Paper text:
[name] is the first DUF3225 family protein that has been shown to possess a catabolic function, likely decarboxylating the product of AtzEG-mediated deamination of 1-carboxybiuret as part of the cyanuric acid mineralization pathway. [name] belongs to NTF2-fold superfamily, which contains 38 protein families, including the [name] family: DUF3225 (DUF: domain of unknown function).
As 1,3-dicarboxyurea is unstable, it was not possible to produce crystals of [name] in its presence. This may suggest that Tyr22 is the catalytic amino acid residue in [name], possibly acting as a proton donor (consistent with the catalytic role of tyrosine in other enzymes), with Arg46 fulfilling a non-critical function As the substrate analog binds between Arg46 and Tyr22, it seems unlikely that Arg46 has a role in activating Tyr22 (noting that the substrate analog may not adopt exactly the same conformation as the bound substrate). However, this positioning of the active site residues relative to the bound analog is similar to that of the catalytic residues in inverting β-glycosidases that use an acid-base catalytic mechanism, and it is plausible that that a similar mechanism may be used here. As yet its catalytic mechanism is not known, but our results suggest it involves the action of Tyr22 and Arg46, and that these amino acid residues are positioned relative to the substrate in a manner consistent with an acid-base mechanism.
Author numbering:
A (entry chain B): 2 to 129
B (entry chain A): 3 to 129
Write the structure that this text describes.
């Protein structure tokens, strides 16, 4: 894997799915948000204020989340692919409601037979 | 899907995770640096800082205070995918900050020199 860092075609596919994910967040398109998370009990998301274990818990969280005050400005993005089937996506952002905090979002992506999926995610806000 | 938690692979990664946790408590920076992937792509979103590239992470390790190190691990999920990739996610607590619960996420890759962390993210939140 270490011999195949950021193969152009792989990096392009993952970047596309990442943009898809970010677009679905802004429109609260829960169908796409759920589509992009790996459907497995192992999948997990450490959110800004909650820890969710399993796809079912993540999907359930998305159903009960309010689409209000969701906007976020991405400031930095690093997408790295390893071989043909694995990737990480790491971003910094600012959320408009907490202008004094810098946001971090990490995702690990895996290529499944149904396409790229997030297997684990972690979001946090800090003051620098 | 594609070979989830193969016993031998899951055992190797769990061993390296235990190695990492032991090196944190003894502030064994040699082992801490050994376990992070030596690449400019490697990154660590720390509890209080964002570091890009192995050199920035190694530099941070040389200057860090080892004092408030100890922590109770409360949940661990280690998941391996095929033979060469893994994630490790833990929740932890400290008696020194009873109001904060910790999260630590890592993505691991098998290199020719062994398993390495390619990305990590640590954060503390209120209960
Ligand atoms: O607020 C959070 O927990 C993170 C977030 O913006 C939506 C996501 O990336 O799932
Ligand atoms: O104290 C913690 O759990 C987070 C941390 O920075 C140790 C590490 O770098 O793994």
């Amino acid at each position: 894997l270490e011999m195949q860092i950021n193969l152009p075609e792989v990096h392009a596919e993952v970047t596309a799915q990442f943009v898809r994910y970010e677009k679905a967040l802004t429109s609260n398109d829960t169908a796409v948000l759920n589509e992009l998370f790996w459907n497995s009990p192992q999948t997990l998301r450490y959110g800004a204020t909650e820890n969710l274990y399993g796809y079912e818990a993540i999907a359930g969280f998305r159903a009960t989340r309010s689409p209000n005050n969701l906007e976020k400005e991405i400031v930095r993005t690093v997408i790295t692919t390893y071989g043909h089937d694995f990737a990480t996506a790491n971003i910094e952002f600012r959320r408009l409601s907490h202008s004094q905090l810098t946001g971090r979002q990490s995702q690990t992506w895996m290529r499944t037979s149904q396409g790229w999926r997030v297997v684990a995610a972690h979001v946090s806000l800090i003051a620098l």
